[PDB]
């Protein structure tokens, strides 16, 4: 009974090979002690030795009293946890479920032994959790990924395997239906199971079970820390049904219950930005700010929410200030997201993004990379944002390095002189890793942001056709539900904006207007979309509605953009209202004084034609 204590005090000293040797020796001494089997399997799995842990599980004699079946089911679920990375993975969970259901003997024990009420119902929630995990395993995990390393050019059998996998995952989904209904039947207090069932209902492309179950989440998920996951799906469903007011009200009263729910606050904010009702979030932000006890430093969630609100109003300076205040302490759940937001702001400061055609640029990308070095090296976001920072420089060799970085990203997804020294070293590292194009064309589009980055790299470097191909491949997934999402992720919307930009260079504008109307119906605060529709109106000489939407854009921007201000002033000049043009240009200069061509093209003619 002290061999496990020796093993634990031995792994406390952080000797891991020695722990493996000692536990294997104590296992050979007595292979009927299950605790050391579990500890050895856990340790081997944690160190990346999956095969050795599986050998430890299989070699157990167990793989009838209550304890024996308890160790049986614990071994089964531990085997599943080790094999969390197909059919093979789910089999252990299924067998654990079957043995747990047989564990009949529990009923025969408890219904007559008159045990404690706590210990009678304790072995029910466990079974419900097993069922819930099986259902989530079937929903999320995909037996899809093949090697597809070039391989012989096959006529049919690859397609046969593909459709067999499709039938397999459909069977997994319909079996997960049974697993989840069993889970919710065995325990109604499992908020997680209700969430999984709602997600499954939304998943199956149904128009009836959706409103049957994944609308009832207010009754299902009453209150917990995972209510944000319910709220995002509920909001996306409501926006699909154009039931915007209900989506508002559920956020209203859920935040009335919890003023400090920063993730739900973010969803509320992005919803309002989509609806164009941005100032309506000010009272919610004030309630969150006053929800602090006596004052004190703003919590990182609160600071991130404030920075997001400022950024959505094109108040990028206060956005950067609040985002920088969000990363403290580092390693918080927002610190990665705050860093990503800061890098995005330094990358695209205005509404104009990287896909448009320089000491300020060098300083901006310098600060961007200085922040980027704060990100974990193994994180995917750092790996794609490194390519983004490199492609920001517009240097063709940096474009090549970014292109190769993005190709590496998609391939991996398919399967104070010291600071300057670090900057230079990471630049050299990107250069040497840059020293696969058909992989982008043929592989599954699983990582959308890497696809967008690759597409804009192709466009900036000059190849418009390949950018068209890769972005069409990215957006053939959803083309819509994706835009109607109330999510922080906006890569799809940015893809729509890029498609509008590319179509504006093709001589055609009807499809660009189609895309713009789609995104603006989804998102009323898309100032760049208003700008582009105003511009194509200016091509169509429809100047009144162009000025109207430009005023919309100017209101959303809060009079802090040089390009929409420039075109608004030019429209006022063509409209013969030089006072308004002078006002717009004075706002442009009091915010961005270094913008060229503003005075010499608008202010001079406004002064000249003020009193004709």
Q: Which of 1, 64, 85, 418 binds another protein (CB under 8 A)?
A: 418
**Using CB under 8 A as the criterion, what x/- string covers residues 546-565 for binding another protein?**
----------------xx--
Q: Which residues does 95 contact at the CB level (< 8 Å), separation at least 6?
A: 76
Taking a C-beta distance cutoff of 8 angstroms, is the pair 280, 272 a contact? yes
Taking the complex as a whole, the smallest distance from the CB of residue 595 to another protein amounts, in Å, to 5
Cα separation of 512 and 297, whole Å?
46
Interface residue with another protein, options 216, 370, 518, 551 (CB under 8 A): 370
**Is there binding between residue 80 and another protein (CB under 8 A)?**
no
Output the smallest distance, CB 123 to another protein, in A: 21
| Nearest distance from C-beta of residue 593 to another protein, angstroms | 9
Torsions phi, psi of 59, nearest 5?
A: -65, -10
Q: How far is the CB of 407 from another protein (least distance, A)?
A: 24
| Gap between the Cα atoms of 477 and 468, Å rounded | 15
Residue 63 found at the interface with another protein (CB under 8 A) = no
The answer to whether 397 contacts another protein (rule: CB under 8 A) is no
Selected range binding another protein among 247-255, 319-327, 433-441, 522-530, rule: CB under 8 A: 319-327
Q: Is 49 in the site for another protein (CB under 8 A)?
A: no
Residue 81 makes contact with another protein by CB under 8 A: no
CA–CA separation, 257 and 360 (whole Å) = 45
Contact (Cβ atoms closer than 8 angstroms) between residue 270 and residue 488: yes
Q: What are the C-alpha distances in Å from 234 to residues 224, 238, 456, 482, 546? A: 16, 6, 33, 14, 35
Listed ranges 73-81, 448-456, 549-557, 591-599: which one lies at the site for another protein (CB under 8 A)? 591-599
424 in Cβ contact with 392 (< 8 Å): no
Nearer to another protein, 408 or 601 (CB): 601
CA dihedral of residues 172, 173, 175, 177 (deg, nearest 10):
160
Nearer to another protein, 91 or 538 (CB): 538
Chain residues 108-147 in contact with another protein, contact rule CB under 8 A: none
361 neighbors 333 (Cβ within 8 angstroms): no
Nearer to another protein, 391 or 519 (CB): 391
Shortest Å, Cβ 228 to another protein: 17
Residue 385 belongs to what H/E stretch? helix 380-392
Q: Please report how close the Cβ of residue 326 comes to another protein at its closest, in angstroms.
A: 11
| Residue 183 burial (10 A CB sphere; 0-12, 13-18, 19+) | buried
Q: Toward another protein, which CB reaches closer, 61 or 329? A: 329
Taking CB under 8 A as the criterion, the residue among 1, 2, 14, 205 binding another protein is: 14
Cα separation, 188 vs 342, in Å, equals: 42
CB atoms within 10 A of CB 403: 23
Q: Which is closer to another protein, CB of 371 or CB of 482?
A: 371
Instruction: Pick the closer one to another protein by CB: 198 or 288.
Output: 288
Q: Which of 128, 364, 523, 528 binds another protein (CB under 8 A)?
A: 364
Q: How far apart are CA 486 and CA 232, in angstroms?
A: 6
Residue 206 to residue 564: CA distance in whole angstroms: 42
Q: What is the C-alpha separation between 563 and 532, in angstroms, rounded? A: 11
- Report the distance separating Cα 362 and Cα 63, nearest Å: 62
Look at residue 211 and give its three-state secondary structure: helix
Residue 365 CA to residue 24 CA, distance in Å, equals 53
Binding mask 328-347 for another protein (x = CB under 8 A): xxxxx--x---------xx-
Binds another protein by CB under 8 A, chosen from 49, 248, 586, 592: 592
CA dist., res. 568 & res. 534, Å (int): 9
13 touching another protein, by CB under 8 A = yes
- 441: contact with another protein by CB under 8 A: no
Kindly state whether residue 377 participates in binding another protein, applying the rule CB under 8 A: yes
Nearest Cα neighbor of 341 from 329, 327, 331, 360 is: 327
Q: Which is nearer to another protein, 159 or 356 (CB)?
A: 356
The residue among 307 and 525 lying less far from another protein, judged by its C-beta, is 307
* Contact present, 405 and 433 (Cβ < 8 Å): yes
Rank residues 351 and 523 by Cβ distance to another protein and give the closer one.
Answer: 351
CA distance to 169, 267, 486, per residue, from 230 (Å): 24, 11, 12
Q: DSSP state, 593?
A: T
Q: Is 259 in the site for another protein (CB under 8 A)?
A: no
Query: By C-beta, is 198 or 347 nearer to another protein?
Result: 347
Instruction: With contacts defined by CB under 8 A, name the span among 96-104, 151-159, 367-375, 517-525 that binds another protein.
Output: 367-375
Q: Is 417 in the site for another protein (CB under 8 A)?
A: no
What is the DSSP-derived secondary structure letter of residue 592? Answer: -
Site string for another protein, 279-318 (x = CB under 8 A): -------x---x----xxx------------------xx-
Is there binding between residue 208 and another protein (CB under 8 A)?
no
47 touches another protein by CB under 8 A: yes
Given a contact cutoff of 8 angstroms between Cβ atoms, the answer to whether 169 and 144 are in contact is: yes
Select 203 or 321, whichever has its Cβ closest to another protein. 321
Q: Do 456 and 391 touch, CB atoms closer than 8 A?
A: yes
Q: Could you tell me which residues come within 8 angstroms of residue 425 by beta carbon, excluding any fewer than 6 positions away?
A: none
Residue number, 30 or 416, with CB nearest to another protein: 416
Q: How far is the CB of 431 from another protein (least distance, A)?
A: 17
CB of 303 to another protein, least distance (A): 12
Nearer to another protein, 152 or 593 (CB): 593
List 82, 271, 305, 371, residue binding another protein (CB under 8 A): 371
Q: Which residues bind another protein (CB under 8 A)?
A: 12-16, 46-47, 286, 290, 295-297, 316-317, 320-321, 324-325, 328-332, 335, 345-346, 349-350, 352, 356-358, 360-361, 363-364, 367, 370-371, 373-379, 416, 418-419, 422, 562-563, 579, 592, 594-597
């Amino acid at each position: 009974e002290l061999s496990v204590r020796v093993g634990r005090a031995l792994v406390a000293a952080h000797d891991y090979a020695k722990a493996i040797r000692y536990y294997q020796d104590a296992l050979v001494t007595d292979p009927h002690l299950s605790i050391v089997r579990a500890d050895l399997a856990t340790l081997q799995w944690r160190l990346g030795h999956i095969e050795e842990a599986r050998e430890t599980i299989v070699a157990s004699p167990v793989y009838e009293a209550v304890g024996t079946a308890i160790e049986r089911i614990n071994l089964y679920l531990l085997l599943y946890k080790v094999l969390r990375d197909d059919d093979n993975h789910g089999d252990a969970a299924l067998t654990a479920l079957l043995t747990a259901r047989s564990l009949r003997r529990l009923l025969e024990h408890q219904l007559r032994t008159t045990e404690a009420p706590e210990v009678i119902t304790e072995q029910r929630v466990v079974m419900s959790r097993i069922c819930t995990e099986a259902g989530a395993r079937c929903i999320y995990s995909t037996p899809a990924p093949p090697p597809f390393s070039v391989v012989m050019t096959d006529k049919k059998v690859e397609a046969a395997a593909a459709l067999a996998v499709q039938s397999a995952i459909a069977s997994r989904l319909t079996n997960a239906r049974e697993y989840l209904r069993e889970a919710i039947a065995f325990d109604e207090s499992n908020e997680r199971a209700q969430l999984e069932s709602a997600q499954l209902c939304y998943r199956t492309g149904d128009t009836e079970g959706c409103e049957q179950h994944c609308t009832t989440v207010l009754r299902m998920a009453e209150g917990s820390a995972n209510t944000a996951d319910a709220a995002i799906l509920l909001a996306n469903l409501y926006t699909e049904q154009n039931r915007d007011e209900d989506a508002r009200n559920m956020f209203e009263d859920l935040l009335r219950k919890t003023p400090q729910h920063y993730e739900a606050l973010v969803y509320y904010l992005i919803l309002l930005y989509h609806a164009g009702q941005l100032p309506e979030a000010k009272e919610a932000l004030e309630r969150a700010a006053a929800a602090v006890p006596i004052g004190q430093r703003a919590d990182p969630g609160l600071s991130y929410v404030r920075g997001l609100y400022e950024h959505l109003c094109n108040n990028n300076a206060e956005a950067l200030r609040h985002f920088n205040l969000a990363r403290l302490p580092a390693g918080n759940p927002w610190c990665t997201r705050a860093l990503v937001r800061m890098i995005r702001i330094y990358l695209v400061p205005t509404t104009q993004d990287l896909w448009v055609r320089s000491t300020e640029l060098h300083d901006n990308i310098r600060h961007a990379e200085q922040l980027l070095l704060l990100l974990p090296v193994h994180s995917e976001e750092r790996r794609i944002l490194q390519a983004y920072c490199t492609m920001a420089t517009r240097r063709p060799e940096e474009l090549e390095t970014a292109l190769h970085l993005f190709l590496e990203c998609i391939v991996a997804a398919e399967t104070d002189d010291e600071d300057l020294q670090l900057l230079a070293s990471m630049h050299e590292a990107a250069a040497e890793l840059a020293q696969t194009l058909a992989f982008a064309l043929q592989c599954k589009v699983i990582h959308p942001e890497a696809f967008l980055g690759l597409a804009i790299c192709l466009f900036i470097s000059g190849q418009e056709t390949a950018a068209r191909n890769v972005l069409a491949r990215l957006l053939e997934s959803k083309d819509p539900i994706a835009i109607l999402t109330c999510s922080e992720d906006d890569t799809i919307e940015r893809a729509m904006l890029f498609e509008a930009y590319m179509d504006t260079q093709e001589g055609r504008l009807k499809d660009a207007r189609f895309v713009l109307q789609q995104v603006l119906s989804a998102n009323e605060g898309c100032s760049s979309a208003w700008n582009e529709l105003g511009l194509i109106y200016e091509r169509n000489q429809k100047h009144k509605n162009a000025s109207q939407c430009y005023q919309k854009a100017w209101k959303l921007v809060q009079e802090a953009d040089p390009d929409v201000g420039y075109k608004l002033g030019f429209n006022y000049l063509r409209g013969g209202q030089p006072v308004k043009a002078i006002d717009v240009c004075k706002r442009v200069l009091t915010h961005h004084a270094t913008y060229p061509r503003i005075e010499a093209d608008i202010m001079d003619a406004a002064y000249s034609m003020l009193r004709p």
